Design a protein around this nucleic acid. Structure first.
Length: 393
RNA sequence: UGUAAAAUC
């Protein structure tokens, strides 16, 4: 802090001194400015703030990447946008040019990415769209998606910019090798998740024109083709299993839920049920499958696999006592008890499938009855016994 | 008996 600067200090003093940049990167100095710029500003105070804070590229970049300064930058941007005077256009154009030119570097900065984010939602839409065009289209875009901070720029784009402007991001991410890298990442998955939700024709998109719905659909199909083509890899992955679960769980993605079940899960239920990550996906599939697929799933567990040649152990034996598989059997049982007890719809496709649920329940009850002694050794076993006991009444 | 995210004074 400059020598000449103690409480009861004026904003004009700071602005006139030429020492703003020193205040803005200081904890106490920036604390002062942040409070001062909330008050009533005259035209000239605003003019000076515009010039010193967002007027020259280097100082703007210096403050934007600063732990304290980035807040002041955001406040002054807000004030610039609220001041519809004659210099309005030149200021917003300049701000767009500054960020545009250092896009990647600002995205990857812990503090500057915050400046990018408030600019995206606050700037006039037409100028915010130009910021989006400045996103990199190479390895650097993956870098942004997998960064714990930068990924939020992409999420903000998805939230507040119309799809046409970021369609290149959808196609970039659907590129097989990009999808593999991004979906194998903790933060990269969050980016794909938010895109999927934006691209879903849910109650949140009813404000779209039909042309915009058509655009949304194409982008959805292109992304989902890539997702379903790598479904096996994604369903079993530590991070991307959550995405597959979301797709299977969401009624508004019903057709993709079915694609996944048919071409990924079916015939692999026994093995997937024994995976740490995929076992959760299998549960979701049971919970949300349409009746016809559900019947195939059940039939696969009860009679899809040949029992062990020596011991006579079947798929259901393995699963009941497996560290992860036991949760799938509990899920199967709970579905059946919910159906038979009315807690779950049994009609679907014009028909009441109650008889099928009773069928599957009887099988499970017969198995649990015969194995009650071994099952009572385990928490899962006791849970199933109790589930069945609570049903009788 | 079994997993992620929710990121700045």
């Amino acid at each position: 802090l400059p020598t000449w600067s103690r409480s009861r200090l004026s904003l004009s003093e700071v602005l006139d001194s030429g020492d703003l940049m020193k205040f803005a990167v200081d904890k106490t100095g920036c604390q002062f400015l942040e409070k001062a710029v909330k008050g009533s500003l005259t035209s000239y105070q605003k003019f000076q703030l515009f010039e010193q804070v967002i007027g020259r590229k280097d100082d703007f970049l210096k403050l934007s990447t600063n732990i304290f300064g980035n807040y002041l930058v955001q406040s002054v941007i807000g004030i610039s946008l609220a001041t519809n005077d004659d210099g309005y256009t030149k200021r917003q154009e300049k701000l767009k040019n500054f960020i545009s030119s250092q896009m990647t570097d600002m995205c990857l900065d812990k503090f500057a990415c915050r400046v990018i984010q408030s600019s995206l939602q606050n700037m006039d839409l037409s100028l915010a769209c130009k910021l989006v065009q400045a996103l990199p289209r190479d390895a650097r875009l993956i870098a942004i998606c997998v960064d714990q901070n930068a990924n939020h720029v992409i999420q903000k784009v998805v939230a507040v910019i119309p799809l046409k402007n970021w369609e290149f991001i959808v196609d970039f991410v659907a590129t097989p090798e990009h999808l593999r890298q991004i979906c194998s990442d903790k933060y990269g998955c969050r980016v794909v998740q938010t895109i999927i939700e934006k691209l879903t024709a849910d109650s949140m998109n009813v404000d779209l024109t039909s042309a915009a719905q058509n655009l949304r659909e194409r982008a959805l199909q292109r992304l989902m083709t890539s997702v379903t083509n790598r479904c096996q890899e994604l369903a079993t992955n530590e991070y991307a299993n959550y995405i597959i679960q979301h797709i299977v769980s969401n009624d508004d993605l019903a057709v993709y839920r079915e694609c996944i079940i048919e071409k990924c899960l079916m015939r692999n239920l026994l093995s997937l049920s024994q995976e740490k990550f995929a076992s959760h996906v299998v549960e979701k599939a049971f919970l949300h499958a349409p009746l016809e697929l559900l019947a195939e799933m059940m039939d696969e567990i009860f009679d899809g696999y040949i029992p062990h040649p020596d011991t006579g152990k079947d798929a259901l034996d393995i699963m009941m006592f497996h560290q992860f598989g036991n949760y799938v059997v509990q899920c199967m049982l709970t579905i059946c008890c919910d159906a038979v007890s009315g807690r779950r719809q049994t009609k679907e496709g014009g028909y009441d499938h109650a008889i099928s649920f009773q069928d599957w329940l009887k099988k499970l009850h017969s198995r649990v009855t015969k194995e009650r002694h071994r099952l009572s050794r385990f928490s899962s076993g006791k849970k199933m016994i109790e589930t069945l006991a609570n049903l009788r009444s």
